[PDB]
Amino acid sequence: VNSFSGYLKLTDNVYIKNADIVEEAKKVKPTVVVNAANVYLKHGGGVAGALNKATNNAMQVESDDYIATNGPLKVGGSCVLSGHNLAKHCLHVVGPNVNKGEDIQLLKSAYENFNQHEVLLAPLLSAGIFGADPIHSLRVCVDTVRTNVYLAVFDKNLYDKLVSSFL
Numbered sequence: 001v002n003s004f005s006g007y008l009k010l011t012d013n014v015y016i017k018n019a020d021i022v023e024e025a026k027k028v029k030p031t032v033v034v035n036a037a038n039v040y041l042k043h044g045g046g047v048a049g050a051l052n053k054a055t056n057n058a059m060q061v062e063s064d065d066y067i068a069t070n071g072p073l074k075v076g077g078s079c080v081l082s083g084h085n086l087a088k089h090c091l092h093v094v095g096p097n098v099n100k101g102e103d104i105q106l107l108k109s110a111y112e113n114f115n116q117h118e119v120l121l122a123p124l125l126s127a128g129i130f131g132a133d134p135i136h137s138l139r140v141c142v143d144t145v146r147t148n149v150y151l152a153v154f155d156k157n158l159y160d161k162l163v164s165s166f167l
């Protein structure tokens, strides 16, 4: 039993809700919140901009130190950093950015990072300003992640389309 509430069950291990991941994180305090990161950990907009703003920019400060030490992530890769006031940990995961021409096949590799964590609160990777089809992202999620994933979808209209079209 865990503290996630109001989710629709899609599969054995994947759950979905129309929610603001920032507000969902502040209420649940999950062990892991997933950020929709880029390779530079520049959290300017989309989910990343929202998560960083909710940490009063502490996420960005920590991220800049990480990059100065380690260099950029790979597309499809991840790193674990602090969850600040939102979660114990933040798993920064880089999905392909279609608006940068990145290979959408890398979306599966991105979701594989979730399997290193037993339970996660997450957005749909590569959705939103990353330019992929969220229906596709949900399908890859279900077909790749084996650990327990609680997906937050900010847009109600998209949420109902995702539920109604789910196979």
Ligand SMILES: Cc1c[nH]c2ncc(C(=O)N(C)c3nnn[nH]3)cc12
Residues within 6 Å of the ligand: 019, 020, 021, 022, 045, 046, 047, 050, 122, 123, 124, 127, 128, 134, 152, 153, 154, 155, 156, 158
């Ligand atoms: C910008 C932002 C703040 N909070 C958020 N929470 C979730 C998502 C999201 O992951 N998806 C799939 C989504 N919702 N509406 N359109 N896309 C995006 C945000």
